[PDB]
C-alpha cells in the first residue's frame, strides 16, 4: 500500500497470528527486537523468521534483512505499521524489525513452523 | 486506520495510539505534585 517495495507484505488476517506469536515468544524470552539484533541472529544462523515493518520511511535501512534471509533460507514477512509491531514485541517504542530464535523442546515449535509455512506460500 | 484501546476498548486513530498509551495511563496522583 504505502510502500511498493513490499514483497512479502501480509494482510490483516495472519498479522494477528504473527503478533500473537511475537507476544508468546516475548513471554518465553524467544525473540530479539531491533534490526541490529535480527541481523546478528541471522548471521549466527539461529534465527527462524524475522518480521519487519513497512512504515520505516528509509526502507533500505531494513531492506538488507530480506536479502540476508534469502542467503540463509529464512522466512521473512512485513507488516503494515511499526507501532503495532513494537507494542506487540513487548516494548513501547516503535520497532521496525524483530527476530524469533530457536529453543530446544520449545512449546512454540508447532506455531512457529505453521508461521514459517504460511509465509513461504505467500512470496508469489 | 483504527485500532482498539487496550484500556478503554474504544476505536482510536492509529496515529495517536503511542501517545494515547503514554497519556491515558497518566498517573492520577501526579497531578497534585
Amino acid at each position: 500500500d504505502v510502500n511498493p517495495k513490499a514483497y512479502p507484505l501480509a494482510d490483516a488476517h495472519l498479522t494477528k497470528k504473527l503478533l500473537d506469536l511475537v507476544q508468546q515468544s516475548c513471554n518465553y524470552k524467544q525473540l530479539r527486537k531491533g534490526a541490529n539484533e535480527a541481523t546478528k541472529t541471522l548471521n549466527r544462523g539461529i534465527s527462524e523468521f524475522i518480521v519487519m515493518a513497512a512504515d520505516a520511511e528509509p526502507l533500505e535501512i531494513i531492506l538488507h534483512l530480506p536479502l540476508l534471509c534469502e542467503d540463509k533460507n529464512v522466512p521473512y514477512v512485513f507488516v503494515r505499521s511499526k507501532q503495532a509491531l513494537g507494542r506487540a514485541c513487548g516494548v513501547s517504542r516503535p520497532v521496525i524489525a524483530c527476530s524469533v530464535t530457536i529453543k530446544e523442546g520449545s512449546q512454540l515449535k508447532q506455531q512457529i513452523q505453521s508461521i514459517q509455512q504460511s509465509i513461504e506460500r505467500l512470496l508469489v | 486506520e483504527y485500532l482498539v484501546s487496550p484500556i478503554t476498548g474504544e476505536k482510536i486513530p492509529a496515529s495517536k495510539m503511542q501517545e494515547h498509551m503514554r497519556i491515558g495511563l497518566l498517573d492520577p496522583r501526579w497531578l497534585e505534585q
Binding site: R87, V91, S92 | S5, P6, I7, M21, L25, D27, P28
Partner: peptide, 21 residues
Amino acid sequence: LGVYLTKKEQKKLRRQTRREA
C-alpha cells in the same frame, strides 16, 4: 485491531487499579 501494551504499563495499570480501590 487492538494492540498489546507491555509489561511495564501492565504493572502501572495494576498499581493504578489497586491504589484507586
